[PDB]
Design an enzyme around this catalytic site. Sequence first.
Site, mmCIF file in Angstrom:
data_model
loop_
_atom_site.group_PDB
_atom_site.id
_atom_site.type_symbol
_atom_site.label_atom_id
_atom_site.label_comp_id
_atom_site.label_asym_id
_atom_site.label_seq_id
_atom_site.Cartn_x
_atom_site.Cartn_y
_atom_site.Cartn_z
ATOM 1 N N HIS B 137 37.247 16.683 -25.494
ATOM 2 C CA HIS B 137 37.309 15.799 -26.672
ATOM 3 C C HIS B 137 38.362 14.713 -26.442
ATOM 4 O O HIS B 137 39.356 14.692 -27.170
ATOM 5 C CB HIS B 137 37.573 16.630 -27.933
ATOM 6 N N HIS B 139 39.499 10.723 -26.376
ATOM 7 C CA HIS B 139 39.295 9.298 -26.709
ATOM 8 C C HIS B 139 40.044 8.452 -25.667
ATOM 9 O O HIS B 139 41.277 8.616 -25.499
ATOM 10 C CB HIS B 139 39.761 9.022 -28.120
ATOM 11 N N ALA B 170 38.019 5.883 -33.194
ATOM 12 C CA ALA B 170 37.416 6.888 -34.103
ATOM 13 C C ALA B 170 36.532 7.876 -33.327
ATOM 14 O O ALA B 170 36.465 9.059 -33.750
ATOM 15 C CB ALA B 170 36.659 6.157 -35.181
ATOM 16 N N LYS B 220 27.790 11.594 -27.594
ATOM 17 C CA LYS B 220 28.530 11.959 -28.784
ATOM 18 C C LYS B 220 27.793 11.414 -29.995
ATOM 19 O O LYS B 220 27.546 10.206 -30.055
ATOM 20 C CB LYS B 220 29.931 11.331 -28.797
ATOM 21 N N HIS B 222 28.504 10.891 -33.798
ATOM 22 C CA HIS B 222 29.656 10.761 -34.701
ATOM 23 C C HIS B 222 29.200 10.167 -36.027
ATOM 24 O O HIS B 222 28.467 9.190 -36.023
ATOM 25 C CB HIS B 222 30.741 9.927 -34.024
ATOM 26 N N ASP B 224 30.657 8.236 -37.868
ATOM 27 C CA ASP B 224 31.049 6.832 -38.036
ATOM 28 C C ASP B 224 29.919 5.918 -37.554
ATOM 29 O O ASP B 224 29.931 4.748 -37.932
ATOM 30 C CB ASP B 224 32.372 6.511 -37.337
ATOM 31 N N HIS B 249 30.079 15.424 -34.220
ATOM 32 C CA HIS B 249 30.953 15.269 -35.395
ATOM 33 C C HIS B 249 29.992 14.923 -36.527
ATOM 34 O O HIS B 249 29.440 13.830 -36.497
ATOM 35 C CB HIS B 249 32.062 14.228 -35.083
ATOM 36 N N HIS B 275 35.664 20.020 -33.133
ATOM 37 C CA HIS B 275 36.591 20.350 -34.245
ATOM 38 C C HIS B 275 35.831 21.135 -35.312
ATOM 39 O O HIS B 275 35.680 20.626 -36.436
ATOM 40 C CB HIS B 275 37.286 19.122 -34.865
ATOM 41 N N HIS B 323 42.226 7.343 -42.393
ATOM 42 C CA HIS B 323 41.061 6.859 -43.187
ATOM 43 C C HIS B 323 41.416 5.686 -44.097
ATOM 44 O O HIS B 323 40.506 5.269 -44.820
ATOM 45 C CB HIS B 323 40.434 7.977 -44.012
ATOM 46 N N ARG B 339 38.335 18.078 -47.458
ATOM 47 C CA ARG B 339 38.342 18.036 -45.962
ATOM 48 C C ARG B 339 39.519 18.818 -45.360
ATOM 49 O O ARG B 339 39.332 19.438 -44.298
ATOM 50 C CB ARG B 339 38.323 16.583 -45.447
ATOM 51 N N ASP B 363 41.273 15.956 -28.937
ATOM 52 C CA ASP B 363 40.999 14.786 -29.814
ATOM 53 C C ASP B 363 42.039 13.687 -29.517
ATOM 54 O O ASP B 363 42.432 12.908 -30.425
ATOM 55 C CB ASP B 363 40.917 15.204 -31.288
ATOM 56 N N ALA B 366 42.932 10.039 -31.261
ATOM 57 C CA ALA B 366 42.053 9.803 -32.440
ATOM 58 C C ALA B 366 42.451 10.735 -33.587
ATOM 59 O O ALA B 366 42.583 10.244 -34.720
ATOM 60 C CB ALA B 366 40.596 9.992 -32.098
HETATM 61 AG AG AG Z 1 39.944 9.090 -40.569
HETATM 62 AG AG AG Z 2 40.993 11.159 -38.356
HETATM 63 NI NI NI Z 3 35.525 13.821 -34.725
HETATM 64 NI NI NI Z 4 37.498 12.616 -31.857
HETATM 65 O O O Z 5 37.378 13.426 -33.820
#
Ligand code: AG
Ligand code: AG
Ligand code: NI
Ligand code: NI
Ligand code: O
Lengths: 122, 570, 570, 100, 100, 100
Positions: B137, B139, B170, B220, B222, B224, B249, B275, B323, B339, B363, B366
Amino acid sequence: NYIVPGEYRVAEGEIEINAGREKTTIRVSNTGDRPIQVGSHIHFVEVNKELLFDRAEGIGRRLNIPSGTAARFEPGEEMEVELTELGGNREVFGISDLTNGSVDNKELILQRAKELGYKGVE
Amino acid sequence: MKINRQQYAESYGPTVGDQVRLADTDLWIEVEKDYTTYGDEANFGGGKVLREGMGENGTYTRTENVLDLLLTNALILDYTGIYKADIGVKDGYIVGIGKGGNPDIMDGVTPNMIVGTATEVIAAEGKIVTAGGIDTHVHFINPDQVDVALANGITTLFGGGTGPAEGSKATTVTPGPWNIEKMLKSTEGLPINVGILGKGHGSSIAPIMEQIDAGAAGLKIHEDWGATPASIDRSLTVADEADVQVAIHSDTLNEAGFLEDTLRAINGRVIHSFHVEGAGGGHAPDIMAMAGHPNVLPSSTNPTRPFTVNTIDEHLDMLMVCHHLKQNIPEDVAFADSRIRPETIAAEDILHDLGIISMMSTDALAMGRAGEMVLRTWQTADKMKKQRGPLAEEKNGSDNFRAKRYVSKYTINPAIAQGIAHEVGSIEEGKFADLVLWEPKFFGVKADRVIKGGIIAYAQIGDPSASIPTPQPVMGRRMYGTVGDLIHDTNITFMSKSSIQQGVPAKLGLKRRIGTVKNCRNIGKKDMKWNDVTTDIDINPETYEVKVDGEVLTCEPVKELPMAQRYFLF
Amino acid sequence: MKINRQQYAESYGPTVGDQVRLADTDLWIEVEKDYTTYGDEANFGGGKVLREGMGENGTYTRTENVLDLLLTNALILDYTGIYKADIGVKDGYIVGIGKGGNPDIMDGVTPNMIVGTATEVIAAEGKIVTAGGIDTHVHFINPDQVDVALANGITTLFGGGTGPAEGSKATTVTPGPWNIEKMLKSTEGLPINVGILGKGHGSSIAPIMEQIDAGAAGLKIHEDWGATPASIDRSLTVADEADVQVAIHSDTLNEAGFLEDTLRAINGRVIHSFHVEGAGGGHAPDIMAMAGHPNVLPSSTNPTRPFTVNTIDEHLDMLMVCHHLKQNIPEDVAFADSRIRPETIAAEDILHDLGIISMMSTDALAMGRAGEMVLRTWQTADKMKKQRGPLAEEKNGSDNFRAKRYVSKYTINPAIAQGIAHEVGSIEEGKFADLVLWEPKFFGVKADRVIKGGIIAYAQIGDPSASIPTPQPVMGRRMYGTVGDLIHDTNITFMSKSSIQQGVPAKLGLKRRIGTVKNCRNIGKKDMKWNDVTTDIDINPETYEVKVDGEVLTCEPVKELPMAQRYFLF
Amino acid sequence: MHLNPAEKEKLQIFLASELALKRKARGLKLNYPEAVAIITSFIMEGARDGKTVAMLMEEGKHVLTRDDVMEGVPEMIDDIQAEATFPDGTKLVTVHNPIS
Amino acid sequence: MHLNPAEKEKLQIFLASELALKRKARGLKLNYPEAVAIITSFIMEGARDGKTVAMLMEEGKHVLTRDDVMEGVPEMIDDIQAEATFPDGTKLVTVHNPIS
Amino acid sequence: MHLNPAEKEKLQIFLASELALKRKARGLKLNYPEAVAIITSFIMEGARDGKTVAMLMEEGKHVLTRDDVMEGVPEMIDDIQAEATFPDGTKLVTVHNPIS
Ligand SMILES: [Ag+]
Ligand SMILES: [Ag+]
Ligand code: NI
Ligand code: NI
Ligand SMILES: [O]
Ligand SMILES: [Ag+]
Ligand SMILES: [Ag+]
Ligand code: NI
Ligand code: NI
Ligand SMILES: [O]
């Protein structure tokens, strides 16, 4: 429960080295005027020419001491050491060029030892 | 002649039945077996055993069963065992685990582990040796992240990014053929193994598949980019055809579906759940139920690891900053409370301990820490021993069962999930010589030496102007494996079969070792070493309480961890 | 029109008969001759002489006797002389030492030293210029060691290692074909000249020779691998066939022989004796008697250089740390007392002064200081002047004879010993333009600019954000010679003839200049410039007293050195 | 010491904070990087003292006031973020709007 | 100044020692890198003062005691090694078992 | 903080100056890099205080005297140059023959 980071807790008992191999005690004398220190895994018959001992009794053998340690002989010092048997193929190459083959060839090893003045060839 | 066990362990490292404390944790590992012949131990130095005609063979050429490198007297900690052996390396791979030296004079010498003229020696007596960590994981945001990873024993980075672009900040995504090509070229300069993930998003096959053909090693999905039923379905259709792994994700917002909708889109296909606890992302609040399914390979990211008194206050604010949440927008407050959940973070500790979460990961940059995957794995195992006691499976008062379960989470299991365990992830014959030496006092905290393809890449070492290398300041430094063209021979770029068959390495001028991704689609939870448990995980929608076999999973957060203030200057 | 000699020296640097102090030592060098024509001195700047139609020729193309680079007004300090000249460089080599400028209008212009459109200018007026230092005892342990070497005027590293592996941490050895290949590739990224030594150990020829064929430039016999009669004999047989140098660190323990046994194995063949005094290693206590023999090229390593009040306390403890000695093992105490000897360290100072030890070297990061070979050479010469007085050979109250004897120890003599003096080791026409500029105030302490193949590689220079480059902080920095592909054209990888004939550079993709090792087997002590003395050195086995021509060699340790606390921040 | 990359970088923050504090002690209004360095070092030394993330989120808002800094500096600093080793391991502290 | 590579690195040790000493002054038990930094800087400043290697091998064993450091830190530090410029040039000091 | 390359380098000068000042305070005669670091940091802190280039060209000649430094150090320092941010932006200060 004081914590020593990374500490050992070793099991009970002792480690026997060179288990099951024949042991031989011999007397060795440094006839030279400079110190000689001998490691655990040198073919004993091939040590410094100025160490006097029964060279035949060094053939096919090394010091019976923990791996990576040595016996020290100060100038003029005579003492006993314990030998163990070489293992694996029982061949030696290089070092003093006395063997270059099987340790079984005692006559040839002693002939070369005597010719080059390794002390104590009977 | 006999040696007491204290002196034996001081000289050669521990032997059968001896125990070693892991750093300043309560965790003890026990030597299960030893490949040595007592008295014929290999060692290097003044008057020692690896010398010509003695423990070093003076006859054989390199091709004649002679090693390029011997690690003497290693305490191996691996999913395959906790045991004492010499490790032999040749052509950058592990070729022998056993007993090195000279068959001329020594008993029990493994036949392909001759020390000869061609052999370099690393002394591992009194060291713990592990596989390099596999972080799946990552970034790619800031190249300074690579030394951070190396300093905590990580040797493979799988993930995505183009640097500090918002997409990359992200998501583990290098999107499209051109970005993938540019980052494969960048990778030529990174002294670590790399695999790149494409964007797992689209409603047509071709825009997704062309990333695999361009040199991506996986995908991936995601939220987003739209973690929709269509993007999940097309990504997995592409992965099944290409033999690469998909990471997910999921849709935290439940916008297009709840967890059961995401699982229906997956339709029993293999997937890596990132995660899985959900603080780092996923279906609110029940994403962690993914970790019960046989087709899910579940990982944690590291900031929730393990559950501590500062965790919740840190994570609520981390999520606000990440966020751009506003404390005066009730929808933002409700989102954060849906969350960041003590109920699921506490259960995550126990799910690790039970073998229900199979993997760790960072992670990195990120929502996770590039240099803390190994560190937090052992902090979690230590907390679980304190709170749950020795696992039933344990024997001899040792933590060997728990140590194998936990070392598997950051070595072999990510490698299996990614389709790269033929090359990396464990100390086994035939695998790439990515090896980490640890002083037990520093185990899991700061690596002593990191070996990449049989050459040291990174070392804690001192003053370069000094007579010897131990004087201050001792710090993490790049070594000769990272310099010049040697960075190419000591590291692997992992790529899809299609990109390799289509000649992408030659097209881009890649000089690094090329690794093939394969055997990713025919695996499941049962394939995760020591972490193979499938079960019905129930997450109460009202209370967020987690139940396995009708029993609520809860534990307390701890005020203190080992592998923390004793070691770190900040 | 006449200029007084104070103003002349301020403007153009010193001229014939002028003296210059070396840093803060008592040592004075005198300009022996000057190639200039008084009034036609070359200089560069606003309204100065190297301008088009004036001291710069506006007619000739580069091929037509025009230089790529002129160093104006250099005070050269070399085994060949201490004298004033312009130095002309073209295609990365020194092509002219003499008088540069424009034959249109100037008298005495060396015909191939035209300043034209193609010519860059470095002002050396008021600078001392030497050859780059040749360090032949390098352990490749930590790449941070290269800048340390460059900052003290070293331009060639000969030795061995794979990084901080125990084999490399003890021995200048890159063992076997694979390690040698990996380190030749690493070398592509090191901004300094390099030659790699193989393991000089084995009882068959082939395992040793295959290292030479793989790209090694020589061999190292080290006691840690077995400095036995067989390993010595096979190494020298290989060297005689391959035309490469053998370095030796002999059997300190006298395990398989005394000194006379090692000399019998050598059998009159050529050999480089490393750290010949013996603190750094060798037959206890009489190894230094090696320096009397005509077939021995003897070097010191630097921590014994010179003999000071802290030397013995430092070395006894350094040896304890290096060897893991125990103060409660009488054999370890006896070993240390047999190896660390004020009698031989004191005699080593005088043997340098007499021309009986021919060479300096570091032992970088194994038992010596990467950046102190040049520094300690001049500290030794200064101590010897204080204690023994001007040498008989001196004239005009200058130290020119002692300065040539000492500069030879770290420039030309190691180059000759290694078979590389056709390329490097002195400021002579036809040799590679490895040049070091020194401010006299900093001479031997901190190099101003290090030129590698005619481009500056390293410079003491200031704030990169400033209007001019002199503002603080002034520190050692890598320059454009180290950047991109220019690192390939400015540095030499030295290799065996066989590895070159077999196409190893093309096989490995080496882009660096390839230097051929040759003419190493047909040399002896008589070939060491200004340091050519053979003599019977007697070392008393009981008292360790050293005698040459029936006279005990002893001197006092000094409490203070020049080139120390005046200069260094730590 | 075994310094890792972050331990080496974060030494720089402590140093910038020492420089800034000397500048405050001789009566200068502090600038943007000075103010950030002071509040950052405070957080990291607080973690070392064993304070909680919650304590440092409160305290960090009272280290400097607008009369300690130049015109506009309060409005330039939206928040200050730092990771440090607490007794329970590395945690992130964010101090929101540290200067009013 | 003409700083060489080692002079730049060794500035970091002095800085870590200043950080550690401030942490000791506010009553913290010192950790592993703090203890190493304090004793290392002591050795290097001792060399600068013109002390002998022998004096610093003795004094370095009395800079910190076990009541100054965290549980286990004394046992983690086998020795501390530093090279510094003495009046007679660079020498190596090793302080063996500096903390009991 | 947004440190640029020069801000990171120039932190080192302040640090070397702090080290040197501690060495002066315990009665050592200062060496070449110590003297340069002290006078350099003085100039940069002077710019930060809002002094003029002209004031610092005068003051820099009175920071250290020959009785503060080792034999030869005054003659080794021809001048000390530093760029710093004045209220009117970056300017160069040179202090000529700072020590007699
Ligand atoms: Ag965020
Ligand atoms: Ag975050
Ligand atoms: Ni994620
Ligand atoms: Ni990530
Ligand atoms: O993530
Ligand atoms: Ag040594
Ligand atoms: Ag040693
Ligand atoms: Ni040596
Ligand atoms: Ni050496
Ligand atoms: O050495």
